[PDB]
Write a structure and sequence with these properties.
Blueprint (H helix, E strand, L loop, with lengths): L1 H12 L2 H14 L2 H7 L3 H17 L4 H19 L8 H13 L5 H15 L3 H6 L2 H16 L7 H18 L8 H13 L6 H14 L5 H21 L4 H18 L15 H18 L12 H14 L6 H10 L3 H17 L9 H11 L9 H16 L6 H19 L8 H13 L7 H4 L11 H12 L9 H9 L9 H4 L7 H9 L3 H9 L7 H10 L14 H21 L8 H19 L5 H6 L1 H22 L5 H16 L8 H12 L2 H14 L19 H20 L8 H11 L10 H13 L9 H8 L2 H7 L4 H11 L3 H4 L7 H22 L5 H17 L7 E4 L2 E4 H7 L6 H10 L14 H20 L4 H21 L4 H13 L5 H15 L4 H7 L1
Antiparallel strand pairs: 1-2
Helix pairs in contact: 1-2, 4-5, 5-7, 6-7, 7-10, 9-10, 10-12, 11-13, 12-14, 13-14, 13-15, 14-16, 15-16, 16-18, 18-20, 19-20, 19-21, 20-22, 22-24, 25-30, 27-28, 27-30, 27-31, 30-33, 31-33, 31-34, 31-35, 33-36, 34-37, 36-37, 36-38, 37-38, 37-39, 39-42, 40-44, 42-45, 45-47, 46-48, 47-49, 48-49, ...
Length: 1040
């Protein structure tokens, strides 16, 4: 250390001639013992190189070799320093990168080189990705974008654009985001891109622009709307005059799709429905439509003649907005009729398919019939063509759209029935074609479900003999046929179908086991067939209940108040039942006889067990078979043998961990097993089938799975830095290990309901030591994944966990959050996963010493997060997470008996803290608190709260909203603040009849004081009056 520093100082103090060889001496001076003792610093050697560079640059074209040499020298030094861990501080390195490229004295190759190390090291490491401050991000974006705007054009312009893309992503993901005043910079770049033809970095500039609009979509919506009206005409000109680069076209389409989503949130058409309308936008949309109509007739727009999905989706969105120069379905019909080749016909068929699917109301019922003749005419060609699946899909969508309408006339309905009968006749022949099997069965199922064509005796022959193989679309059509029709008795037809479904070749696995099927579909079909009235069982079986920019669009509708979530015993045939039981045991016996310990697949055996427990679950759901006799039934006896045979594969893998080919099979094993279980507590065949599967599992199998869990737990391009929670850090073993652990997690929570052979306590205890402080390493990407999912799956509100388990579960939470404090994405994920603990922490029945310990441990980390959030250290995404988890705290303890967080020695109630977020700086946070404020007026466990508590909660919320109003171009913010206040009042009025009079008076005062929109408030009061039950608004006004 001291000797190295002395040698470096002597070399630095030496003359230039001695420095010629001292550079190599210093480079070779580094050694393994030197780096080991140097770890702490690196700033000392860094500034020695800093002044060495600044001294050398002071003293023609001959210097172009020296500047390249020193650039390589610093590249090697930085790589060696950061090879193991990033000890070097990003701050001083960033400033040097700033000042080496700001000046024009340095060569172009040097700034290009300096940008290379900057991207490959600073922006490729998560540590530097988080520690770069907001001020650094803005200055980092500004200097390189001006360099991009510089008139000099070189090969490095692509690299500079890649820097700009990475900086924009970093600022929009790690900080609060750069100001909207930089939008003029992008406008100038687009204007410059209009003149220049090279467009070297236009792909990254537009992609960075797309990210900025996505991040800046919550606020300044009109400003984004106005800028869209400015750049889109230039983008249309760029598209026409460019060479049509595939990557540039894709990002342009993404920008166009983002603009339409902003202007028309979730397909809004009129201005009063939440859409934004202007003359420039209408002309732009018409001009945008003309370009895409021209572009579809191109070879590169798609051997494959299918137009890309993004084009199809963008096509339907534009058509829906422009449908009412005159435009409509007439041009679509003309194109379909006049198209003689599938090249110019498949795109339009895909266009109509997506428009009908996305917007059922976009197609008038008058044009429904003319489209039906066109589709029928395009169906037959005496053979099978490329357009056939497309014609089948749109016909299915037409049938689905037809079934959703009840205003059709009698004459129109009769014409449609005759047309659909003709459609059914055409599509029935040629069913043997396997290529269009999925589309044909889907069309038949849709027609059968809608009762468009009456079923005939010939259709029932399809599921007989070897006419067709058991497939998912075939079963989906069959279950709809059994639901809306009665099986003819041609004891024979029902028997024949059950042979076809359970046809096993006397070494090929049956297709039902070979291919995955939706849970409890074949089982319900079989049970319904065996009992007296197959139609009745389907109706009763289906009667049971079941367990991006979209969030931004939902925000706009709630902003415009067009969307508001609030204020809104049987008999069985004995012969058929015995026949099915004989077939199930016969199929199972065949599987065991053909089973081998090495070559036979295991997921087929579990699928057979899933089918076997499914029919038993369906049988136990009715009064035909009780649970007690189902346990001793020969089916259940075959069930345990299937798993026991499949259990040895896990046992073998427990010893042969190094095997990799087994991983793919075992990963499929849990996916079947995990989906077998059902955590929902309602009485349903899914719950009964899950209970049978739980009772199947033995004590030997859990220990093998747990032992494999313990064994694998001890093992050891992208624009910017890689998220530590990304799936690319998870290998096959890592992905596998997360799989059965989730299977173990679901087993523990749901096994206690029934009586099982295995002890769930032992698994849970073993799971606790899996995150033991000595063993668990939060810095490891794998170890982070388990603790997050264990925090998500183990807690359960129904039956509280052993309360010593949760404190051990919550023990590493403080350490994990402290290590990942600077990572916004990890903090948001941790907060979203920790809220599941509150459902068990709320119940204070066993209020003991350790009970108050776990509550204190949970409250201090939440209080630290709230304090750190108040210090402006978290992004908006974390702010919802803090709001969301605190909402669960409010739900768990409405009276705040124990939910009191302590910070700097001061106690802050949870209820009082929630009202603070109503005056936040992010528009998305404000309504989420405004929508979730209803927890302060009702128990949410629907009993009301005490009068005094309700009065002070409403008063505190109203004054905070008023404070947010008064702490104020600005029109967007003004409209944003008004929407939150109106949403706050509307929610209070709906959920709090106690404060109905006070809230109404508060709105009345706010009309003249806060300047609320008279039309917006009038619509709200009409809606709540409709919700309450008042026929007219005047009566509900007159009541108060």
């Amino acid at each position: 250390l001291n000797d190295l520093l002395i040698c470096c100082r002597q070399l630095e103090h030496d003359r230039a001639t001695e420095r010629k060889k001292e550079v190599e001496k210093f480079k070779r001076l580094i050694r393994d013992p030197e780096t080991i003792k140097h770890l702490d610093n690196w700033d000392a050697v860094f500034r020695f190189l800093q002044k060495y560079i600044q001294k050398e640059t002071e003293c023609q074209a001959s210097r172009q070799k020296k500047m390249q040499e020193i650039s390589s020298l610093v590249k090697y030094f930085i790589k060696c320093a950061n090879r193991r861990a990033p000890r070097l501080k990003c701050q001083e390195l960033l400033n040097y990168i700033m000042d080496t490229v700001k000046d024009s004295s340095n060569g172009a190759i040097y700034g290009a080189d300096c940008s290379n190390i900057l991207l490959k090291d600073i922006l490729s490491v998560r540590k530097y990705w988080c520690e770069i401050s907001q001020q650094q991000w803005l200055e980092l974006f500004s200097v390189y974008f001006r360099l991009y705007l510089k008139p000099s054009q070189d090969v490095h312009r692509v690299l500079v654009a890649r820097i700009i893309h990475a900086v924009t992503k970093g600022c929009c993901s790690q900080t609060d985001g750069l100001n909207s005043k930089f939008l003029d910079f992008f406008s100038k770049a687009i204007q410059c891109a209009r003149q220049e033809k090279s467009s070297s970095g236009l792909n990254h500039i537009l992609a960075a622009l797309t990210i900025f609009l996505k991040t800046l979509a919550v606020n300044f919506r009109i400003r984004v709307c106005e800028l869209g009206d400015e750049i889109l005409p230039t983008l249309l000109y760029i598209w026409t005059q460019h060479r049509l680069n595939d990557s540039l076209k894709e990002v342009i389409i993404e920008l166009f799709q983002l603009q339409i989503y902003i202007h028309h949130p979730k397909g809004a058409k009129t201005q009063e429905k939440g859409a934004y309308e202007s003359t420039k936008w209408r002309s732009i949309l018409y001009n945008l439509y003309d370009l895409l109509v021209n572009e579809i007739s191109h070879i590169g727009s798609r051997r494959n003649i299918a137009v890309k999905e993004n084009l199809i989706e963008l096509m339907a969105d534009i058509c829906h907005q422009v449908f009412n120069i005159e435009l409509g379905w007439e041009v679509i019909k003309d194109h379909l009729q006049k198209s003689q080749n599938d090249f110019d016909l498949v795109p339009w068929l895909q266009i109509a398919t997506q428009l009908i699917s996305k917007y059922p109301a976009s197609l008038p019922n008058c044009e429904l019939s003319p489209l039906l003749m066109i589709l029928s005419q395009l169906l037959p060609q005496q053979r099978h063509g490329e357009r056939t699946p497309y014609v089948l899909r749109c016909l299915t969508e037409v049938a689905l759209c037809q079934d959703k309408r009840s205003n059709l006339e009698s004459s129109q309905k009769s014409d449609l029935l005759k047309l659909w009968n003709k459609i059914w006749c055409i599509t029935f022949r040629g069913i043997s074609s396997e290529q269009i099997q999925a589309e044909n069965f889907g069309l038949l199922g849709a027609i059968i479900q809608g009762s468009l064509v009456e079923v005939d005796r010939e259709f029932w022959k399809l599921f007989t003999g070897s006419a067709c193989r058991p497939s998912c679309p075939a079963v989906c059509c069959l279950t709809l046929a059994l639901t809306t029709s009665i099986v003819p008795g041609t004891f024979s037809l029902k028997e024949s179908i059950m042979k076809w479904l359970l046809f096993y070749q006397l070494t090929e696995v049956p297709p039902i086991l070979h291919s995955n099927f939706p849970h409890l579909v074949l089982e319900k079909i079989l049970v319904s067939l065996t009992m007296k009235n197959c139609k009745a069982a389907m109706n009763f079986f289906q009667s049971v209940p079941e367990c991006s920019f979209s969030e931004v669009e939902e925000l706009f509708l709630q902003t415009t108040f067009d969307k508001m979530d609030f204020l809104t015993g049987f008999s069985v045939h004995q012969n058929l039942k015995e026949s099915l039981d004989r077939c199930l045991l016969g199929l199972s016996e065949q599987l065991l006889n053909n089973y081998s310990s090495e070559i036979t697949n295991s997921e087929t055996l579990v699928r057979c067990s899933r089918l076997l427990v499914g029919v038993l679950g369906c049988y136990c759901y009715m009064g035909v078979i009780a649970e007690e006799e189902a346990y001793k039934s020969e089916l259940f006896q075959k069930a345990k043998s299937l798993m026991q045979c499949a259990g040895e594969s896990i046992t073998l893998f427990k010893n042969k961990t190094n095997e990799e080919f087994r991983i793919g099979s075992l990963r499929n094993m849990m996916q079947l097993c995990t989906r077998c279980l059902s955590n929902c507590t309602k009485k349903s065949p899914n719950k009964i089938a899950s209970g049978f599967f739980l009772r199947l599992l033995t004590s030997k199998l859990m220990n093998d799975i747990a032992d494999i869990c313990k064994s694998l737990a001890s093992f050891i391009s992208t624009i910017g830095a890689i998220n530590p929670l990304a799936e690319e850090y998870l290998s096959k073993q890592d992905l596998l290990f997360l799989d059965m652990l989730k299977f173990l997690c679901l087993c523990v929570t749901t096994a206690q309901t029934n009586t099982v052979s295995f002890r769930a306590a032992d698994i849970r205890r073993k799971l606790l030591m899996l995150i033991d402080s000595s063993t668990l390493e939060p810095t490891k990407s794998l170890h982070l994944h388990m603790y997050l999912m264990l925090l998500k799956e183990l807690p359960g509100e129904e039956y509280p966990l052993p309360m010593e388990d949760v404190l051990e579960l919550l023990k590493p939470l403080s350490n994990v959050c402290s290590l990942y404090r600077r990572d916004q994405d990890v903090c948001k994920t941790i907060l979203n996963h920790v809220l599941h603990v509150v459902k068990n922490l709320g119940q204070s029945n066993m209020d003991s010493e350790n009970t108050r310990d776990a509550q204190g441990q949970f409250l201090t980390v939440i209080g630290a997060f709230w304090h750190l959030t108040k210090e402006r250290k978290y992004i908006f995404s974390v702010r919802m997470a803090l709001v969301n988890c605190l909402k669960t705290l409010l739900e768990a303890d409405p009276y705040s008996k124990w939910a009191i967080l302590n910070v700097m020695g001061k106690d802050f109630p949870v209820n009082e803290v929630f009202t603070q977020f109503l005056a936040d700086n992010h528009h998305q946070v404000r309504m989420l608190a405004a929508e979730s404020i209803n927890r302060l007026f009702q128990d949410t466990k629907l009993k009301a709260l005490p009068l005094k508590l309700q009065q002070t909660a409403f008063e505190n919320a109203y004054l905070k909203a008023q404070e947010g109003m008064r702490e104020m171009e600005t029109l967007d913010e003004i409209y944003n603040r008004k929407s939150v206040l109106l949403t706050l009042i509307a929610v209070v009025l709906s959920c709090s009849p106690i404060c109905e009079k006070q809230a109404l008076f508060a709105l009345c005062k706010s009309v003249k004081e806060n300047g609320l929109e008279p039309h917006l408030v009038k619509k709200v009061l009409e809606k709540v009056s409709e919700t309450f039950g008042y026929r007219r608004l005047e009566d509900f006004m007159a009541s108060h």
